[PDB]
Design an enzyme around this catalytic site. Sequence first.
Site, PDB file in Angstrom:
ATOM      1  N   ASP A 296     -44.301 -87.771 -31.615  1.00 36.74           N
ATOM      2  CA  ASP A 296     -42.799 -87.127 -31.828  1.00 36.74           C
ATOM      3  C   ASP A 296     -42.665 -86.519 -33.240  1.00 36.74           C
ATOM      4  O   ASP A 296     -42.551 -87.584 -33.990  1.00 36.74           O
ATOM      5  CB  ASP A 296     -41.909 -88.034 -31.200  1.00 36.74           C
ATOM      6  CG  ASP A 296     -40.491 -87.897 -31.706  1.00 36.74           C
ATOM      7  OD1 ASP A 296     -39.780 -86.719 -31.529  1.00 36.74           O
ATOM      8  OD2 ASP A 296     -39.749 -88.862 -31.828  1.00 36.74           O
ATOM      9  N   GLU A 314     -38.065 -82.985 -31.060  1.00 34.86           N
ATOM     10  CA  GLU A 314     -37.808 -84.311 -31.002  1.00 34.86           C
ATOM     11  C   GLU A 314     -36.552 -84.556 -29.751  1.00 34.86           C
ATOM     12  O   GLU A 314     -36.649 -85.295 -28.823  1.00 34.86           O
ATOM     13  CB  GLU A 314     -37.465 -84.863 -32.208  1.00 34.86           C
ATOM     14  CG  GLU A 314     -36.622 -86.529 -31.999  1.00 34.86           C
ATOM     15  CD  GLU A 314     -36.845 -87.236 -33.134  1.00 34.86           C
ATOM     16  OE1 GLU A 314     -35.962 -86.803 -34.222  1.00 34.86           O
ATOM     17  OE2 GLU A 314     -37.420 -88.240 -33.160  1.00 34.86           O
ATOM     18  N   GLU A 315     -35.386 -83.792 -29.923  1.00 35.38           N
ATOM     19  CA  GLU A 315     -34.344 -83.562 -29.077  1.00 35.38           C
ATOM     20  C   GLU A 315     -34.956 -83.472 -27.969  1.00 35.38           C
ATOM     21  O   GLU A 315     -34.445 -84.084 -26.938  1.00 35.38           O
ATOM     22  CB  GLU A 315     -33.237 -82.592 -29.493  1.00 35.38           C
ATOM     23  CG  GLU A 315     -32.608 -83.212 -30.928  1.00 35.38           C
ATOM     24  CD  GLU A 315     -33.115 -82.464 -32.200  1.00 35.38           C
ATOM     25  OE1 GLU A 315     -34.293 -81.838 -32.351  1.00 35.38           O
ATOM     26  OE2 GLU A 315     -32.789 -82.863 -33.242  1.00 35.38           O
TER      27      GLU A 315
END
Length: 521
Positions: A296, A314-315
């Site tokens: 990530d 990431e989100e």
Amino acid sequence: YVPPNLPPDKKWLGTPIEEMRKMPRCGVRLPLLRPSASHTVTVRVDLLRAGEVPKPFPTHYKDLWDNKHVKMPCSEQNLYPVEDENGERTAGSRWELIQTALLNKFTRPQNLKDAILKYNVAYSKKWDFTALVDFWDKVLEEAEAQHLYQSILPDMVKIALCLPNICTQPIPLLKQKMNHSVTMSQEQIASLLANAFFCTFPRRNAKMKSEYSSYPDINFNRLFEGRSSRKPEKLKTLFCYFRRVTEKKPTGLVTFTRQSLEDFPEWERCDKPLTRLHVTYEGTIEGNGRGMLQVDFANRFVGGGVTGAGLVQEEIRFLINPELIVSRLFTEVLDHNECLIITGTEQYSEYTGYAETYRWARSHEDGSEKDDWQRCCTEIVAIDALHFRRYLDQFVPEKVRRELNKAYCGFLRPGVPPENLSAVATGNWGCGAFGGDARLKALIQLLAAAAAERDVVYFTFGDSELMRDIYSMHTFLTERKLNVGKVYRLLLRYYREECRDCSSPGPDTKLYPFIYHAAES
């Protein structure tokens, strides 16, 4: 030296992905899951059974309200000011207030706003709910809206209000420098996240000063604000998860581990050889990297802007595997020598697009198998790359070394024999807004993996030129038997010869060509 021509029709280069190690097959027999000074376990391990909801340990709620544990909404010490018969302050129970606020018919988005503001009255003129109204009244059609407010919302309230029966053990903060793990159930996470949606966690909202300055946001208030068009897709994604877990209690466990190393390798002397590579311009980390250590590309505040505005790599991962969001409740901002390793999260959604074109596509049925601690066999590591104000800053030896160490922390599993380690599934770490060079970062990760004795599967997301370049360089170096130390030495030479004394946005020669000339001549 020009690299040879490679097949032009071919979607992948290197070791066949069939030959990379993956979990569950490659794993060491797991020892009995048990608590210790280094491992908090919040469930009854003796009763764990595939397809049965884990039972909490201990049986009854035990509270800690201090600086080492999550401050729970349901604590007797979660207080609010009430006026007595003379208008003086008495302390009332914020949990009792939350309960009576949330146990109301929402038929209208203003009903939900009103509930949330009862135990957040300090934010009544600060928290905007435009995006919630918009989602509810304009994005969703009448039938979806109806289902939201008479079925999903009420069921979220229920798991949220059962927190004290579900999360009976205090949760330790994973602070900077701690080497520590917490394993908890997917059901526990669902209750925690339902609380996050209703903005129930106390003391996690202050800007002007807080005990939690050092931690990511957990409450979801910022998801409701603003005139953004992404936000409705974020909500759709999160409601997909909430509908699924309220309709059917999840049965797995999830382990969250903070890992710090204090002493790293002297890269110049590292005698480890390069490991295997599969590199492709097709496939996804989450899809085609099933059973591998999936990277990530993290913000040092894990999850980045997922509870607000923020929808890049990431989100997006935190939204489709939403159990990762709960790490924000207890994970302190990552220092240079740290990473967070999360094992067991499940993918609930599929999506298309990225940032401004992101949209929720459909529900996903995760078909992972479960390990002997009934975790889904999905291991994700948050490693945060540096942000470079200027391109050339990243070739400075201390920056190269910081990125090597960070990635190496993410990849190393001390003690475990390399044959029981899965391949790493990664890609262009830090190469968007953070200004990183894909070709340098590809090589740094390859060196990191090699020093951790792991193979790499690298996804270039449609860049076939990058695929070929990365393949060419790995093969050049492996063919010539150059160990990690020799390669790191060449990175240093590039800096000294081409970057160190350069007054220009770029240098006269790129890194890979420099390496070819230097290594062979």
